[PDB]
XYZ file of C-alpha atoms in Angstrom:
157
model
C 51.651 125.769 130.154
C 48.758 128.595 129.119
C 48.933 131.873 127.796
C 47.158 134.629 130.011
C 44.624 134.917 127.021
C 44.122 131.430 126.775
C 43.756 130.795 130.489
C 41.448 133.464 130.266
C 38.922 131.944 127.092
C 39.058 128.762 129.751
C 37.586 130.227 132.434
C 34.746 132.608 130.634
C 34.372 128.908 128.761
C 33.493 127.629 132.638
C 31.669 129.973 133.347
C 29.532 130.131 130.829
C 28.553 126.433 131.320
C 27.898 126.919 134.738
C 25.656 130.465 133.825
C 23.246 128.075 131.884
C 23.018 125.235 134.212
C 25.108 123.078 131.715
C 26.224 119.475 132.909
C 29.329 118.788 131.693
C 31.528 121.699 129.784
C 32.279 120.614 126.215
C 33.808 122.353 122.873
C 30.783 124.740 121.868
C 32.032 126.668 125.354
C 34.877 127.622 124.750
C 33.744 128.411 120.968
C 31.264 130.548 122.969
C 34.188 132.407 125.410
C 36.259 133.699 121.609
C 32.739 135.399 120.932
C 32.480 137.788 124.605
C 33.902 140.989 124.731
C 36.917 141.392 125.992
C 37.361 143.071 129.631
C 40.628 144.555 127.115
C 37.881 147.083 125.423
C 39.500 145.315 122.409
C 38.252 143.323 119.672
C 38.576 139.403 119.850
C 40.663 138.318 118.226
C 38.395 135.523 116.620
C 36.404 137.932 115.195
C 39.324 139.934 113.913
C 39.924 136.545 112.136
C 35.730 135.859 110.604
C 36.013 139.958 109.558
C 39.288 139.855 107.968
C 38.599 136.187 106.416
C 35.146 138.522 105.605
C 32.418 136.345 106.453
C 29.826 138.027 108.652
C 30.692 137.941 112.716
C 26.666 138.699 113.551
C 25.926 135.789 111.388
C 28.639 134.236 113.701
C 27.407 134.234 116.775
C 24.006 134.511 116.396
C 24.975 130.714 115.762
C 27.129 130.023 118.196
C 24.877 131.134 120.565
C 22.118 129.534 119.491
C 23.938 126.503 119.891
C 24.797 127.568 122.977
C 21.317 127.939 125.186
C 19.596 125.090 123.422
C 21.901 122.367 124.966
C 20.411 121.350 127.935
C 20.317 122.466 131.387
C 20.837 119.999 133.872
C 18.981 120.373 137.430
C 20.370 118.393 139.735
C 23.239 121.083 138.423
C 26.072 118.371 139.569
C 28.711 119.314 142.151
C 30.870 120.163 139.070
C 31.050 120.826 135.677
C 32.960 117.745 133.586
C 34.778 118.633 130.713
C 33.319 116.565 128.258
C 35.312 113.621 126.294
C 35.388 115.809 123.472
C 36.886 118.404 125.465
C 40.189 116.146 126.318
C 40.982 115.631 122.805
C 40.644 119.333 121.835
C 42.977 119.920 124.911
C 44.919 117.465 124.211
C 45.437 118.418 120.717
C 46.283 122.083 121.462
C 49.220 121.278 123.002
C 50.352 119.032 120.026
C 49.541 121.899 117.746
C 51.705 124.079 120.189
C 54.089 122.140 119.783
C 54.874 121.841 116.467
C 54.154 125.685 116.166
C 57.425 125.519 118.175
C 55.622 127.730 120.226
C 56.722 127.554 124.586
C 52.918 128.502 125.970
C 49.271 127.110 124.699
C 47.952 129.827 123.465
C 44.583 131.015 122.541
C 45.675 130.215 118.219
C 46.403 127.129 119.527
C 42.966 126.369 120.839
C 41.231 127.928 118.251
C 43.816 125.118 115.681
C 41.978 122.208 117.733
C 38.807 123.677 118.175
C 38.826 122.822 114.373
C 39.119 118.392 114.480
C 36.303 118.346 116.515
C 33.073 117.338 114.651
C 30.650 120.050 116.835
C 32.484 122.491 115.827
C 33.203 121.481 111.921
C 29.070 120.974 112.186
C 28.762 124.758 113.984
C 31.258 126.480 110.943
C 29.515 124.983 108.490
C 26.158 126.196 110.026
C 26.997 129.834 110.268
C 28.315 129.346 106.801
C 31.815 129.939 107.616
C 34.602 127.943 105.654
C 37.332 126.679 108.439
C 40.594 125.930 105.835
C 39.874 130.167 105.610
C 39.774 131.323 109.161
C 43.448 128.552 109.463
C 44.286 131.176 106.456
C 43.463 134.399 108.949
C 44.846 132.826 111.851
C 48.860 132.287 110.169
C 48.431 135.333 108.585
C 47.480 137.499 112.248
C 50.183 136.021 113.783
C 53.148 136.109 111.268
C 56.195 135.097 111.948
C 54.993 136.204 115.828
C 57.106 133.637 118.442
C 54.358 132.146 121.325
C 57.303 132.667 123.831
C 55.510 134.581 126.632
C 52.153 134.135 128.974
C 51.431 137.869 127.024
C 52.443 137.064 123.745
C 48.935 136.008 121.922
C 47.352 139.447 121.561
C 44.185 139.661 120.155
C 45.640 142.190 118.097
């Protein structure tokens, strides 16, 4: 039910939590995964949105990364990294947004749209001086009338 790229982001999100000894997986981890460099050698999806929206991407990354690495480490590192409640709702929202867009798979677009409904994410965008509604408009423009009907459909470009 997830696209390849959506899946990459969720996996990347898990690695990020792990690499920093964070106890729970949270929305910030997904946001933080959006700004990793793709192995793709390509421009990240969210970077395109931010720059076409004409915000400062460098300042944006600093703000996001600073919110990630200031999450306090837990040792005893739990056997698992639990998805928190906020993240559960975010994923649950992404599937609803997928259906409203009449798409067949949950894409990185849907996850990004779902992240916007979460309060911590909103607080982060406000710290980075980025208007969420503007990014939402860029996201629609990015996608045009493209149907997300394959797991490869949600291109970064």
